[PDB]
């Protein structure tokens, strides 16, 4: 892969201090494809903060609006990210991704992780669910009609143990590049589904459904557990 | 840091061909500092791969000899790998990582998971170890006068779950810049002991004992799995 964000920064950031980090891409211009960044505190599912697009058009996490800004240096391909009045709340790994006209959000850096320390809006998920070797397995995906609903903006992530996110499935059904078909996708009203089949022990992950939402935001789910049960 | 390392190269090699991977750095010269090669299979210990210092000399796993060249461009900043004849036993996360003079293999890169398909010498520690906050637990690694008895070039690393091992003692002893002190290493015949005393819920993680060899190799320990007991 050519394409890459690489996201940098200070970590450690003091409580009511400014935490800015700059996510520096290349083999691929701003000006083509959007930049949105995403955050995953110790022990917690992906929450989006915001993005931007190729026109400078930018986009928050109404929760995290207050103390936001993203801008962007085309010069130099870079996209910055300030969050102001930081607190221990949000200590997390930051990741930057790209998020393309026909592909999704396809690329993720590797995240950076950032500590607030001093002295030393709803898409639900089955919290865990298991199959065996060879069998198919389903996730699904409850939201509303601002999102899940509003049409065909649903995407499906994986995320091994410490690790970026891995897109799926775009557009609802759509299998991303280099995805293996036994991912498949499918939506029936407020509901989207992942569905698994072949079960591998390497698929054994965590699983997130994220969708747009009427209000030009971005929703994540809470996250599904796959267990992979075998006979060794 | 400015110092970074970053793995680069195929995304999957076909059996009895040819793995090859670039190591660009960034921060430093390699006519500076050192740069050696790691890899870990899927659930698995660290396993020494080879190294290239200042002036271009190498030095390789006996193991993996046979089939290793490690080359250099100073120029362009790079390291490169080539592992010739592989088979599924070199699936792996490949680490590039820094030697240096005073400081020990402290910076290392993010990990580059390559795996060997088609279409279808020894240190010795506990395998578990565990504790609740505040008490101190100790990890002992055995080996012999080659290595851990050779002299002081004894190193401990922490890994957590999919990430690059971070150093913590280097010189059996000496403890790692940006380490807190709670970590101390000390020697006693062909035994080293990590002691990590007020025990906190980050260091829940595995912990590798590294030593020099008379043969000019680097041996790994098996590994340490240590666990810290909540009330949650």
């Known amino acids: 892969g050519q394409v890459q964000l690489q996201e940098s920064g200070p970590s450690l950031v003091k409580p009511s201090q400014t935490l800015s980090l700059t996510c520096?891409?290349?083999?691929?211009?701003?000006?083509?494809?959007?930049?949105?960044?995403v955050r995953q505190a110790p022990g917690k599912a992906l929450e989006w903060?915001?993005?931007?697009?190729?026109?400078?058009?930018?986009?928050?996490?109404p929760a995290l609006k207050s103390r936001l800004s993203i801008t962007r240096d085309t010069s130099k391909s870079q996209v910055s990210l300030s969050l102001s009045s930081v607190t221990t709340e949000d200590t997390a790994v930051?990741?930057?991704?790209?998020?393309?006209?026909?592909?999704?959000?396809?690329?993720?850096?590797?995240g950076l992780l950032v500590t607030v320390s001093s002295g030393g809006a709803v898409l639900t998920q089955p919290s865990s669910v298991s199959g065996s070797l060879g069998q198919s397995v389903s996730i699904t995906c409850?939201?509303?009609?601002?999102?899940?609903?509003?049409?065909?903006?649903?995407?499906?992530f994986q995320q091994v143990p410490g690790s970026a996110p891995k897109l799926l499935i775009y557009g609802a059904t759509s299998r991303a590049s280099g995805v293996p078909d036994r991912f498949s996708g499918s939506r029936s009203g407020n509901t989207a589904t992942l569905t698994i089949s072949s079960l591998q022990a390497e698929d054994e992950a965590d699983?997130?459904?994220?969708?747009?939402?009427?209000?030009?935001?971005?929703?994540?789910?809470?996250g599904t557990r796959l267990t992979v049960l075998g006979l060794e | 840091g400015q110092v970074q390392l970053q793995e680069s190269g195929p995304s999957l090699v076909k059996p009895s061909q040819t793995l090859s991977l670039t190591c660009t750095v960034s921060?430093?010269?390699?006519?500076?500092?050192?740069v050696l090669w790691v890899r870990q299979a899927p659930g698995k210990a660290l396993e020494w791969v080879g190294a290239?210092?200042?002036?271009?000399?190498?030095y390789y796993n006996p193991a993996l000899k046979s089939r290793l060249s490690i080359t250099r461009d100073t120029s362009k900043s790079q390291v490169s790998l080539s592992l010739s004849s592989v088979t599924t036993e070199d699936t792996a996360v490949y680490y590039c990582?820094?030697?240096?003079?005073?400081?020990?293999?402290?910076?290392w890169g993010r990990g580059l998971l390559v795996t060997v398909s088609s279409g279808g010498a020894v240190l010795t520690q506990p395998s578990s170890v565990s504790g609740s906050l505040g008490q101190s637990v100790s990890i002992t690694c055995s080996g012999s006068?080659?290595?851990?008895?050779?002299?002081?070039?004894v190193s401990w690393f922490q890994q957590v779950p999919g990430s690059a091992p971070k150093l913590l003692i280097y010189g059996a002893t000496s403890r790692a810049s940006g380490v807190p002190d709670r970590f101390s290493g000390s020697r006693s015949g062909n035994t080293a002991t990590l002691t990590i005393s007020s025990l906190q819920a980050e260091d829940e993680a595995d912990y590798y004992c590294?030593?020099?060899?008379?043969?000019?190799?680097?041996?790994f320990g098996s590994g340490t799995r240590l666990t810290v007991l909540g009330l949650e």
């Open positions: 990582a820094r030697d240096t003079d005073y400081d020990g293999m402290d910076v």
């Open positions: 290239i210092y200042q002036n271009g000399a190498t």
């Open positions: 921060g430093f010269s390699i006519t500076s500092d050192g």
């Open positions: 590294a030593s020099g060899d008379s043969g000019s190799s680097l041996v």
């Open positions: 006068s080659s290595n851990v008895g050779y002299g002081n070039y």
